[PDB]
Design a binder for this molecule. Structure first.
Ligand code: HEM
Ligand SMILES: c1ccc(-c2cnc[nH]2)cc1
Length: 375
């Protein structure tokens, strides 16, 4: 269990992320802390180009390697996309590419910014005695003034944490199935349903803290990758680390272990078959920290909650199971509405979206198809 690096309070998010690196990495830290200015005034690229190659060995624990991932990943996005107006670098300079690749290998993560970087590790309490609420939180790194990264990253994080309340119930679910404890099972499912329902309310804050124009035309540009991306159709050259350019997807909540873990728990077969949706979500596992990916693997290897509940002729159980599925449908439905507002409308207003809506609708529909009764 401790092997899975799941926090009782923050779930898959990294508890108390670190904010400073050893003095030895000030050169990295200074660029990452000043990205809005450096990018805007056109100093970012030359600074990166002028860095000495720093060794990764003075990053001695997990939290500090994670902070360096976040730093280097942000710097890399800034360097590749520049001011975010379509002029793009195709080579990442060795003095940054080499340690970032080394560090990424060590953490078993791709050398690009992932969800686990810019959400799960990218946050702090303002006041350590107050609760984890938006007003008491901040992010550690942004790209551009006005990019709304704080609102986008924190509200993801807050959803992620609300859903974590349910994660701790999962061992109860499996124990109750093996012990044939019917009332314990039912209570456990109603409790998962309740947390996933809470996570929806938390989603509503996206409208308060993120503005569609700034999201669509700025933040989205900095989070994009180089896989199947025509601005970088062969990927990115990690100078000095690989000979050939490599492709990696940009940061995506398809990399959240939260939603993937409930789809597995409930037997919603999100990654089955060979369609586009299933493959993208299977591929996104390779972007999750290894401990969380081992967690998903071990969920798949347990007996099926859905089969258990379907074989019992127990309406109470059926309805508790359906309330879990329905909570996921509701969340995915609200999310589709958000995408219409934050991507589809802004895109239509500028002087593709159908493949995106269809991907999301396929995932929602596969979730709906899992309802036992129809509700
Ligand atoms: C402005 C707000 C948001 C926009 C524009 C948006 C956009 C998208 C897009 C474009 C995808 C497709 C895959 C990809 O391109 O990476 C997606 C998938 C997804 N998003 Fe968001 N998103 C938003 C907010 C959120 C938030 C707050 C969460 C909560 C953690 C979230 C969870 C997901 C998940 C889990 C998927 C994967 C498909 C699924 O499991 O249903 N999104 N989103
Ligand atoms: C950081 C936070 C959230 C996201 C995201 C939201 N929906 C899809 N990806 C991507 C990066």
């Amino acid at each position: 269990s401790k092997e899975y690096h799941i926090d009782e309070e923050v779930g898959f998010a990294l508890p108390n992320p670190q904010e400073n690196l050893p003095d030895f990495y000030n050169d990295w830290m200074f660029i990452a802390k000043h990205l809005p200015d450096l990018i805007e005034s056109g100093q970012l690229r030359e600074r990166v180009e002028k860095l000495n190659m720093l060794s990764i060995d003075h990053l001695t624990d997990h939290k500090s390697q994670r902070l360096a991932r976040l730093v280097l990943g942000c710097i890399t996005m800034a360097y590749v996309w520049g001011k975010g107006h379509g002029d793009v670098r195709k080579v990442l300079p060795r003095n940054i590419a080499v340690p970032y690749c080394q560090l990424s290998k060590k953490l078993e993560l791709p050398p690009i910014l992932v969800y686990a970087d810019c959400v799960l590790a990218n946050w702090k309490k303002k006041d350590p005695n107050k609760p984890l609420t938006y007003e008491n939180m901040d992010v550690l790194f942004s790209f551009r003034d006005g990019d709304c990264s704080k609102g986008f990253f924190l509200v993801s994080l807050l959803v992620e944490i609300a859903a974590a309340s349910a994660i701790k119930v999962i061992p109860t679910v499996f124990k109750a199935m093996q012990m044939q404890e019917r009332d314990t099972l039912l209570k456990a499912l109603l409790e998962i349903a309740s947390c996933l329902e809470k996570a929806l309310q938390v989603f509503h804050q996206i409208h308060d803290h993120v503005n569609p124009k700034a999201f669509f035309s700025v933040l989205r540009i900095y989070l994009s990758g180089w896989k199947g991306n025509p601005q970088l159709s062969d990927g990115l050259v990690y100078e000095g680390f690989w000979e050939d350019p490599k492709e990696f997807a940009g940061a995506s909540a398809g990399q959240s272990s939260v939603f993937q873990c409930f789809d597995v728990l409930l037997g919603i077969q999100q990654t089955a078959g060979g369609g586009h949706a299933a493959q993208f979500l299977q591929d996104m596992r390779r972007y999750m920290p290894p401990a969380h990916r081992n967690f998903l693997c071990s969920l798949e290897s347990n007996p099926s909650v859905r089969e258990f509940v379907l074989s019992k002729g127990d309406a109470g159980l059926r309805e508790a199971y359906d309330a879990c599925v329905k909570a996921l449908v509701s969340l995915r439905s609200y999310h589709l509405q958000i995408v219409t507002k934050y991507i589809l409308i802004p895109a239509s207003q500028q002087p593709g979206g159908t493949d995106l809506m269809n991907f999301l609708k396929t995932v929602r529909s596969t979730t709906e198809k899992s309802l036992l009764k129809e509700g």
